[PDB]
């Protein structure tokens with residue numbers, strides 16, 4: 001074996017060369033927070049939420065993108081790792097709209113949850129927030145782009161897995177927007193999966209819209225029958241009524257996606 | 264003779280909107296044959 | 308100022324655009340500057356070529372650049388909305404760009420912005436009603452010692468006063484083309500009160516060449 | 521040598537800086553360009569890299585990385601991918617107008633630099649990524665490249681050396697961020713000019729995924745003069761680890777704003793009072809100097825009195841050398857308006873990729889726009905300081921650093937002027 005030895009908080013772990021910092025921390029049961037990293041999409045490195053201190057290094061590294069060198073001690077819980085996480089969460093929540101009650105992502109929001117777990121408890125932003133024009137990409141995905149945090153999981157899903165190349169970023173700076181730039185309708189056979197991986201409620205399910213809320217739903221693990229792939233699903237119900245259908249991760253079938261008929 | 268009193272770069276007063284691209288088209292005959300990645304595009 | 312497209316009757320995917328055949332030979336020369344398999348690298352010149360023919364970019368020039376380079380159209384829309392030169396609205400015949408960053412602001416670019424506004428009767432972002440002049444306000448143009456300065460379509464007009472830029476707009480309205488240079492006494496970038504350096508003749512080929520060469 | 525500056529005209533690398541001689545091939549060959557270029561190329565890559573490492577040349581783009589150590593990263597055996605020198609001619613920095621002068625007036629010096637540097641790094645071709653706003657300079661450089669192809673100096677069998685080397689010019693399209701080397705690489709590749717993360721450094725995965733060195737126009741155009749005159753001749757100027765000559769752009773509130781080539785560790789006061797005619801109203805009218813273009817923090821008048829204009833003496837003056845673009849600001853300058861216009865530049869020139877620049881530079885611009893009017897309370901100074909520290913080192917490229925640093929310099933040297941601005945706002949509006 002050619003495994004290199006690295007350290008996560010002093011704990012030795014033997015990792016394959018080419019492994020990122022985030023995967024090396026995954027191997028000891030620590031989960032580095034993330035918004036743009038996804039293990040089935042390409043590495044983006046553009047939310048900076050995964051910034052972690054390697055010790056004896058005066059700069060945090062994007063753990064989703066940085067490969068481990070031999071002998072690093074990844075400080076997942078040091079003071080400047082936490083200051084980096086609170087600063088990046090402050091910038092993510094600076095222009096974010098106060099929509100948490102009227103948002104379908106509430107209760108199951110990555111942004112809410114790791115704002116609670118890794119960011120500050122309050123605001124210093126005394127300014128006015130931006131407001132993004134909404135888009136119309138079809139009858140399946142409700143689009144409220146003020147909630148977008150520009151993680152580009154849209155674009156990497158549509159380009160790399162759905163293979164569509166219709167989503168992109170237009171503009172520059174804080175005015176950069178996610179969309180198709182024209183009135184174009186994103187209707188793939190895998191189009192609803194962008195509802196799953198959007199960490200915020202910028203892309204939501206238009207059929208599921210406003211009807212339920214994640215804590216009150218019951219999660220029955222079950223099988224798709226819309227094709228002979230046999231996708232593993234979660235039928236989430238509420239008070240004896242089927243509310244929605246999510247995927248289950250099965251690595252050998254449907255890795256974590258389902259089709260739009262299934263959904 | 265030696266002259267240090269005039270501005271010798273007076274050519275760019277006469278450049279049109281297609282000067283750069285016609286110069287590139289003129290240069291196209293001089294150049295080495297490009298390398299290939301073996302495919303027509305990364306979507307091929 | 309927007310970054311979504313709405314189909315107007317003058318900007319729609321059936322607005323007539325096609326390159327001239329000499330522009331197709333120019334596009335062939337552009338694509339031959341890049342390796343085979345990376346034709347997408349010619350998105351930025353060819354799209355700019357589409358702006359040099361048409362004056363601006365309707366969304367059929369974007370579609371034509373996407374079609375002849377075999378890239379997706381969104382990959383051209385990203386380039387057209389990222390870069391500040393691609394005019395996604397038709398600008399006037401003379402596209403005045405006044406630099407108002409700090410090196411040009413400290414040498415009073417505001418006076419020249421105001422002088423262009425009171426000469427043309429428009430403000431920043433507007434176009435004159437005869438479609439001749441579009442006045443916008445740009446960032447640093449790389450002519451900082453020649454502050455204050457403007458750019459008109461290809462040309463830098465430098466070391467300007469309000470009277471100089473009024474004269475430039477006068478001889479632009481008269482059909483002539485002015486000299487792209489500093490309107491002060493100096494030529495390009497030298498100190499104005501005589502050369503403080505390079506007053507000697509250059510030494511010529513072979514000066515100071517070390518041994519073994 | 522303890523005193524620096526007063527560079528002689530026989531020691532100038534960029535003769536014909538001012539456009540007073542012929543920039544074309546007949547004018548360039550009679551100034552020393554393309555002299556014994558075959559003899560330089562036939563001494564191989566290792567000799568040229570030894571001359572650049574011996575010269576102590578640091579990267580003239582603005583960071584000052586050691587140029588020979590940088591270019592030696594390409595000196596490795598191939599694996600099927602071609603190799604590319606890419607010349608950074610974008611030059612978006614406010615204050616900086618020197619690479620325009622090299623391209624406009626000494627283009628064959630840049631082309632011979634492309635050939636010598638690409639031979640040093642084994643590069644197949646040169647992409648000179650030029651600013652799109654420099655149309656006349658790009659056509660100027662294209663005429664010089666046509667003269668270099670027709671003289672047999674580049675292309676097939678460059679200078680009779682049996683080394684094949686093309687020189688391409690790529691025009692930008694109006695982005696400051698496409699001066700950053702990985703964003704410039706993405707801009708050559710037909711995409712949005714968004715910076716790549718590092719690693720991979722461009723010597724591993726650069727333009728088109730090939731080995732690639734991005735280098736400034738100035739650090740490329742001095743390399744044949746270094747290889748002819750010797751690395752010791754170049755290293756005999758400036759302080760130690762600060763070797764050579766440098767182009768300086770004195771702009772703002774001086775009597776004669778100019779580009780001038782000077783020895784490295786020249787004092788700032790000597791540079792201004794010699795080549796620029798002094799600060800308007802005399803040296804006692806000086807308020808502040810941004811030493812190296814917009815990304816470096818300002819220094820006040822008390823620091824400008826003794827400091828030397830190289831990398832190390834300006835890092836000791838808690839600023840940077842940067843692009844050596846000296847912006848001079850006299851006592852009549854509203855300095856908060858100038859720094860806020862600079863942060864407004866940084867939010868109009870920010871690509872939007874990562875979170876701290878995309879959000880925090882607009883939020884710093886809003887805080888600075890309230891600071892110009894005084895529409896703030898003094899506890900928002902320190903907050904803004906921390907906002908800068910949350911952008912600094914948390915971003916992908918150094919535009920986030922380059923937007924944090926003017927805010928930090930303004931706060932650090934001019935907190936009381938901000939405070940009196942805010943308190944006169946508070947007394948005339950409440």
Ligand SMILES: NC(=O)C1=CN([C@@H]2O[C@H](COP(=O)(O)OP(=O)(O)OC[C@H]3O[C@@H](n4cnc5c(N)ncnc54)[C@H](O)[C@@H]3O)[C@@H](O)[C@H]2O)C=CC1
Nearest residue numbers: 581582583585611612613616699701721815842843917918
């Ligand atoms: N010239 C101009 O117009 C502008 C210049 N700047 C200056 O640019 C600087 C920031 O630019 P950066 O490229 O981000 O600075 P720096 O962090 O990256 O690196 C400088 C150079 O060294 C190389 N390098 C550094 N460490 C390396 C390693 N371990 N292996 C291989 N290569 C390595 C990089 O590839 C780069 O080309 C600042 O000093 C700023 O003042 C900023 C804006 C405009």
Ligand SMILES: Cc1cc2nc3c(=O)[nH]c(=O)nc-3n(C[C@H](O)[C@H](O)[C@H](O)COP(=O)(O)O)c2cc1C
Nearest residue numbers: 579580581608610611612699700701735736918919
């Ligand atoms: C936002 C940003 C803009 C930059 N713009 C330029 C530029 O316009 N020209 C330049 O030579 N370097 C620029 N740089 C520095 C480059 O990253 C790189 O260091 C340089 O182009 C090549 O290295 P060198 O100094 O050895 O030549 C910029 C850096 C950043 C972060």
Ligand code: SF4
Nearest residue numbers: 099100103106109201
């Ligand atoms: S996306 Fe998350 S943080 Fe934003 S409004 Fe919805 S629940 Fe709240």
Ligand code: SF4
Nearest residue numbers: 148149151152154198
């Ligand atoms: S809409 Fe969602 S998935 Fe798409 S870029 Fe924005 S936050 Fe990411």
Ligand code: SF4
Nearest residue numbers: 872873874877915919
């Ligand atoms: S910090 Fe700004 S300039 Fe750099 S990758 Fe991010 S958005 Fe781009």
Ligand code: FES
Nearest residue numbers: 036047048050064
């Ligand atoms: S998760 Fe690594 S930066 Fe987004």
Ligand code: FES
Nearest residue numbers: 406411447448450
């Ligand atoms: S500041 Fe106006 S040209 Fe650089």
Ligand SMILES: [K+]
Nearest residue numbers: 195198200203
């Ligand atoms: K979602």
